[PDB]
Design a binder for these strands. Structure first.
Length: 1274
RNA sequence: AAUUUCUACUGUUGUAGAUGAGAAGUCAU
DNA sequence: ATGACTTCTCTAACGAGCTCG
DNA sequence: CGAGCTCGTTAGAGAAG
């Protein structure tokens, strides 16, 4: 049970709303320029960061290159890594810490004491102080306007002279940058973070630079290669000027060599980005636009050394690639003109695209398509590939299914011809061990050798040979004339889409015009489908030449090589019409205020300028204007103490590490608080802390419990003297029972939150709104109306419990600050598409109602058709008792008293069902069992595989007229969200824990949506502030960190290994790990000799193969089987007509062993009759029998009929077909695919109810443990 | 086809569920 | 071209700096 | 020039598979 598992840790939601402009606020908002003069700010703030991160680049350009030389200590780090990468010892894993925290401090002390660093993260960046010049404009004007570096030209901003007009226009706005001057302290950081530029060099360039020099001098062994220092260094000459030197001393102008490279003392050259562009250039190889190919590189000599030997081990000493530096850069057609201008420019390349013979596409290619029609030329210069592309010939001209496509394989796979069988069933789970290269190729002479034998199989001599199709291009020049005739009809849609910044072609008004270009995309659409019939892919078997000539394939690449832009264009404007209309920017409203609502707090209300209100459960926002911002001071509230709205007194104490030593020990009020001798002594040297900083100008001494618990005693003598903070009613614990400073601030910030209500009369608000000294908005969604028949959302079941009375008894929902306001521009013209009162037809066919009346109108989507405000407002749930470390471990200690009580869930994947839960109790007897297609079971009961069953057939829409709007691209993710609720209502109600598939696409995004969707879980129609309510409710899972470190247990969703659950009988537990494969005739006979007795059931009427696995070596498991030949089993085949051909077990044997000299009706061992039999035709159709004597899952044309059968009997002597099963066994081919996860997981409650005193107990399953366990619940 | 936004709906100027937001950062099925 | 995954804050009050007093 | 004075810093605790 989970009834004691409430109130565990702190979250950070973001309740979002829409703001309704009430009174006449939006008259005033458009009266002054606060939206027109917005989004030239808030779309240049987001364009300011190409005038600051074009300065963080140029800063790192001169803090790591010329300077910051961590010289010769790299040899100290070289020694602590090569010896460490074999051995994990305390002699060196803590000396791994040595040059870890030495090189960074050798760097970061040069970072934090540098030239431009100090005046970078304050006001001195943009505009500093009166008379002085700030660093950025000093950089931009006095270094970059004078020294003209034309690098603003490579962006959307025109020049530097306009760029300065942005920078001056942020004067006064430099606390609107507390989200962007947060992500630059963590670029020059020095910490355990994966973000910095110092983590980049010290932890992910240097430890992958030691691997580069260790495998460079090993490459100097067996090195005869013509590396460019042996022949020519003019190639990498200007690229390797190298006016510095970090080996001995800097030389003016000499060019380095390969001796300088990979030196441990020359890594100081290879630190920043300007130099990873020279490390990974000598390794990489530069391009030259002087009619040159790619010049020679180091790993282009490991290919030039392989001209002498073809070693697989030759490539293992190549050069890797170091990463790119943080924030440096090298130096989705959503434009409506580019849909027409691309093909309009692409249409112009036909007359300008010429061949190699000095003629045009028509001036030379016209007569070339009418000369070799007799096939007199060498038509054997072709090379195909027999993987997927071979079916286009017979599927294009023969119109067959499994006849012409199966006549190339047997002649090609029998090259070396080591083989006897096929059809590999497992296949689980590995790719390769060392290497494997064999054995086949692709060409056209095998088509002459495999189809030419069938060319003479007809009666008459006018059949289909391999050479009777050479005249397919008799009008190759005239075929382009059809696309040219469809070019004159483009000026209308080009006139209809003449606007650039509109995106006004994929609207509903251009619905009929979409056939003007989608049907216009048919003249070049199908030709590209046939355009791949003149060039094979790179399916070469290590000798990809194929005898390429230049006679027949001379002018093909000169004209047809330019035809790939239709694949670029038609493959580029697919999602342009597919995409739904959103077309916004969703930009932050400021209301002319760098701090719009950082915090809703009373002493700083005239600078956040944002107030909330309450009137009869309709929640309000109030944004004051800045010029009138003291209009709710203490004066104008004592006057207007009337009745009307309510008003919010949100009083806050944030950062008790940052606050209580801010007021008590600073220059304004230290004398009134009067610190003593002993108490200021402690805070001088940080004596009350374990890692706390001292006052700067001291040194960190020891922690003392005596010099900490007396320092907590100071704080009970200065908060009470603070003029306001005495009113919180702090009630601390006794200072004998405070352990340190961490267990004291858990009783400051868990009480520094007071929320009271002081009434404001309505008539006072209406005056200042109409005058303009407020902006009153309304907090609104579906759940705030009188048209609320039933259940609310969660983002309104929360907001109605921020301001609640029962919230403020003891706070479990703390309003946070930091919030913003957003304004979305409109993108949809309102066209109604459902007029008044008429009959409207449904779309759910599971409905006891077929029509709809609807007096009013219903527009397509009323969201985007209205210019709406938006308000995002964070909270912090379980604010007073946060923490919950070791939360995987804490829920496991919950279970130990709770044995014999908690039932177990289970969830598959699939596409036959989509999931299949099964509530397994402690003893395998399942309680519930239901699918997840019919879900949403209130009374509507919609169905979900059936909706996919046409969107499984989605690959038809965008092909003809380029019109695909059918929602695969979001429905995938969205089905799972309904499931999340429905998993969860079972979890709590059945005292249930959850298992899953471990996964050691939307194939893990369900499991994503049960971690962060059981952070905190709340049932809407549960009793308020009762055991699972909205205040006190269920937190069961620790949050999501990664999918990788998700681990075996991320809460109560355990995991079991994915393999061997879907082929198992429930009552006994067989798996066919034995793989009958038929290598050869006698090479199967030793398998049949290993059986116990292949007798017959004269008493029953079916064969049986008694067997034990241990006489074969794999090894699977241990037990006397006696498998049988009972149930009717189905076999699929090549569908296209042939998808089901049912084969009986016993009838197929009695046809076959009776056909040979084997008599069997007596009923004893028939070993030596089979073992003595030695026919080619016998065993090939006998191992295939036992292949399908054990194929326990059977479809019919799966789906719609996919039941369960099972060979093996039991102690009852009974088999198991699913149609004669009771309820407490599985039912389908995914229900047995889920029930074993539902008892592989049951021993994860077998371990945890019996966990050691040693509290480590891993949750990994070895396969033999399960394979024994399931067989032995009996 | 109505939404704080997304999917699915008629569940009737909405019902049932879902929900963490901004701005950066590297990098890969 | 989407999914990965590492990081910030989720903020009141003091105090340098300011326009004048 | 002490009031004022509006906007930017600045006070800096703590578990670790």
């Amino acid at each position: 049970i989970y009834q004691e598992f409430v109130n565990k840790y702190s979250l950070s939601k973001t309740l979002r709303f829409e703001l309704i402009p009430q009174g006449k606020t939006l008259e005033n908002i458009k009266a002054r320029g606060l939206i027109l003069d917005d989004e030239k700010r808030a779309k240049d703030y987001k364009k300011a960061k190409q005038i600051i991160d074009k300065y963080h680049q140029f800063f790192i350009e001169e803090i790591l290159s010329s300077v910051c030389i961590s010289e010769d200590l790299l040899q100290n780090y070289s020694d602590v890594y090569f010896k460490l990468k074999k051995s994990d010892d305390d002699n060196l894993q803590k000396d791994f810490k040595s040059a870890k925290d030495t090189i960074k401090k050798q760097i970061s002390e040069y970072i934090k004491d540098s030239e431009k660093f100090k005046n970078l993260f304050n006001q001195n960046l943009i505009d500093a102080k009166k008379g002085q010049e700030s660093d950025l404009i000093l950089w931009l004007k006095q270094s970059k306007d004078n020294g003209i570096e034309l690098f603003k030209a490579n962006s959307d901003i025109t020049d530097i002279d306009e760029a300065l007009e942005i920078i001056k226009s942020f004067k006064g706005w430099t606390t609107y940058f507390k989200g962007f001057h947060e992500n630059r302290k963590n670029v020059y950081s020095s910490n355990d973070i994966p973000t910095s530029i110092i983590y980049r060099i010290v932890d992910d360039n240097l430890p992958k630079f030691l691997e580069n020099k260790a495998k460079y001098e090993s490459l100097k062994d067996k090195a005869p290669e013509a590396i460019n220092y042996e022949q020519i260094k003019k190639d990498l000459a200007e690229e390797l000027t190298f006016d510095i030197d970090y080996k001995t001393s800097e030389v003016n102008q000499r060019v380095f060599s390969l001796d300088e490279v990979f030196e441990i003392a020359n890594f100081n050259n290879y630190l920043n980005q300007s130099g990873i562009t020279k490390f990974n250039t000598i390794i990489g190889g530069k391009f030259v636009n002087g009619e040159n190919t790619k010049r020679k590189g180091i790993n282009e000599y490991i290919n030039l050394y392989s001209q002498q030997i073809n070693d697989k081990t030759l490539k293992k000493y190549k050069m890797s690639v170091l990463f790119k530096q943080i924030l440096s850069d090298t130096e989705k057609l959503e434009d409506d003109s580019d849909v027409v201008t691309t093909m309009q420019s692409f249409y112009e390349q036909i007359a300008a695209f010429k061949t190699v013979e000095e003629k045009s596409i028509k001036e030379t290619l016209s007569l070339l398509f009418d000369d070799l029609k007799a096939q007199k030329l060498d038509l054997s210069k072709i090379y195909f590939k027999n993987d997927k592309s071979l079916t286009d010939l017979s599927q294009q001209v023969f119109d067959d299914y499994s006849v012409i496509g199966t006549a190339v394989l047997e002649y090609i796979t029998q090259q070396i011809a080591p083989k006897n069988l096929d059809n590999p069933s497992k296949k689980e789970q590995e790719l390769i061990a060392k290497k494997t290269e064999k054995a086949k190729y692709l060409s056209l002479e095998t088509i002459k050798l495999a189809l030419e034998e069938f060319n003479k199989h007809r009666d008459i001599d006018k059949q289909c040979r391999f050479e009777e199709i050479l005249a397919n291009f008799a009008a190759i020049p005239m075929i382009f004339d059809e696309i040219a005739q469809n070019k004159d009809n483009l000026a209308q849609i080009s006139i209809k889409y003449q606007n650039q910044g509109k995106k006004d072609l994929l609207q509903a008004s251009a619905e009929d015009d979409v056939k003007a270009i989608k049907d216009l995309l048919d003249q070049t659409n199908n030709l590209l489908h046939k355009l791949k019939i003149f060039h094979i892919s790179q399916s070469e078997d290590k000798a990809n030449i194929l005898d390429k000539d230049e006679h027949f394939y001379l002018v093909f690449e000169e004209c047809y090589f330019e035809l790939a832009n239709i694949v670029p264009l038609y493959n580029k404007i697919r999602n342009y019409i597919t995409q739904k209309p959103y077309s916004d920017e969703k930009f932050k409203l400021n209301f002319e205020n760098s701090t719009l609502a950082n915090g809703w707090d009373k002493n700083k209300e005239p600078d956040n300028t944002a107030i909330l209100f309450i009137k009869d459960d309709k929640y309000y926002l109030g944004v004051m204007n800045k010029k009138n911002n003291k209009i709710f001071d203490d004066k104008a509230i004592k006057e207007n103490k009337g009745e009307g709205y309510k008003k919010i007194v949100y009083k806050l104490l944030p950062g008790a590490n940052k606050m209580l030593p801010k007021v008590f020990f600073s220059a304004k009020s230290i004398k009134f608080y009067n610190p003593s001798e002993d108490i200021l002594r402690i805070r001088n040297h940080s004596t009350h802390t374990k890692n706390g900083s001292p006052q700067k100008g001291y040194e960190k001494f020891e922690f003392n419990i005596e010099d900490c618990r007396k320092f907590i005693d100071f704080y009970k003598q200065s908060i009470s003297k603070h003029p306001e903070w005495k009113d919180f009613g702090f009630r601390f614990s006794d200072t004998q029972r405070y352990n340190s400073i961490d267990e004291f601030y858990r009783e400051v910030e868990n009480q520094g939150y007071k929320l009271t209500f002081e009434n404001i009369s309505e008539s006072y608000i209406d005056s200042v709104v109409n005058q303009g000294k407020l902006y009153l908005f309304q907090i609104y969604n579906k759940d705030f109306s009188a048209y609320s028949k039933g259940r609310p959302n969660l983002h309104t079941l929360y907001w109605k419990a921020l301001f609640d009375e029962r919230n403020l008894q003891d706070v479990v929902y703390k309003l946070n600050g930091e919030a913003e306001l957003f304004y979305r521009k409109q993108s949809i013209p309102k066209k109604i598409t459902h007029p008044a009162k008429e009959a409207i037809a449904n779309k759910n066919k599971d409905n006891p109602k077929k029509e709809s009346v609807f007096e009013y109108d219903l527009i397509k989507d009323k969201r985007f058709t209205e210019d709406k405000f938006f308000f995002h407002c964070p909270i912090t749930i379980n604010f007073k008792s946060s923490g919950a470390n070791k939360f995987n471990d804490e829920i496991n200690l919950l279970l130990k008293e709770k044995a014999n009580d908690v039932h177990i869930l289970s969830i598959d994947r699939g596409e036959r069902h989509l999931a299949y839960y099964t509530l397994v109790d402690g003893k395998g007897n399942i309680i519930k069992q239901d699918t997840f297609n019919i879900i949403g079971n209130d009374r509507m009961k919609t169905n979900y595989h059936d909706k996919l069953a046409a969107i499984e057939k989605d690959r038809d829409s965008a092909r003809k007229d380029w019109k695909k709007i059918n929602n695969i691209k979001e429905m995938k993710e969205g089905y799972l969200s309904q499931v999340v609720h429905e998993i969860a209502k079972l979890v709590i109600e059945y005292n249930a824990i959850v298992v899953f598939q471990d996964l050691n696409q939307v194939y893990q995004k369900l499991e994503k949506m049960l971690i962060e969707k059981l952070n905190y879980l709340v049932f809407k129609d549960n009793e308020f502030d009762k055991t699972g309510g909205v205040l006190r409710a269920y937190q069961l899972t620790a949050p999501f960190e990664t999918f990788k470190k998700m681990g075996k247990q991320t809460g109560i969703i355990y995991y079991v290994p994915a393999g061997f659950t879907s082929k198992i009988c429930p009552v006994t537990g067989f798996v066919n790990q034995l793989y009958p494969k038929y290598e050869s005739v006698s090479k199967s006979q030793e398998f049949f000799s290993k059986f116990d007795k292949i007798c017959y059931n004269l008493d029953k009427g079916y064969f049986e193969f008694s067997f034990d696995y241990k006489n074969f070596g794999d090894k699977a498991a241990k037990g006397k089987w006696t498998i049988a030949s009972f149930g009717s089993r189905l076999i699929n085949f090549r569908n296209s007509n042939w998808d089901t051909r049912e084969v009986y077990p016993t009838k197929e044997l009695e046809k076959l062993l009776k056909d040979y000299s084997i008599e069997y009706g007596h009923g004893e061992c028939i070993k030596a009759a089979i073992c003595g039999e030695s026919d080619k035709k016998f065993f090939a159709k006998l191992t295939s029998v036992l292949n399908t004597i054990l194929q326990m899952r059977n479809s019919k044309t799966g789906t719609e009929l996919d039941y369960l059968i099972s060979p093996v009997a039991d102690v009852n002597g009974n088999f198991f077909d699913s149609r004669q099963a009771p309820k407490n066994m599985p039912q389908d081919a995914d229900a047995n695919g889920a029930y074993h996860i539902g008892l592989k997981g049951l021993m994860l409650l077998g371990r945890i109810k019996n966990n050691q005193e040693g509290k480590k107990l891993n949750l990994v399953i070895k396969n033999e443990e399960y394979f024994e366990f399931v067989q032995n619940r009996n």
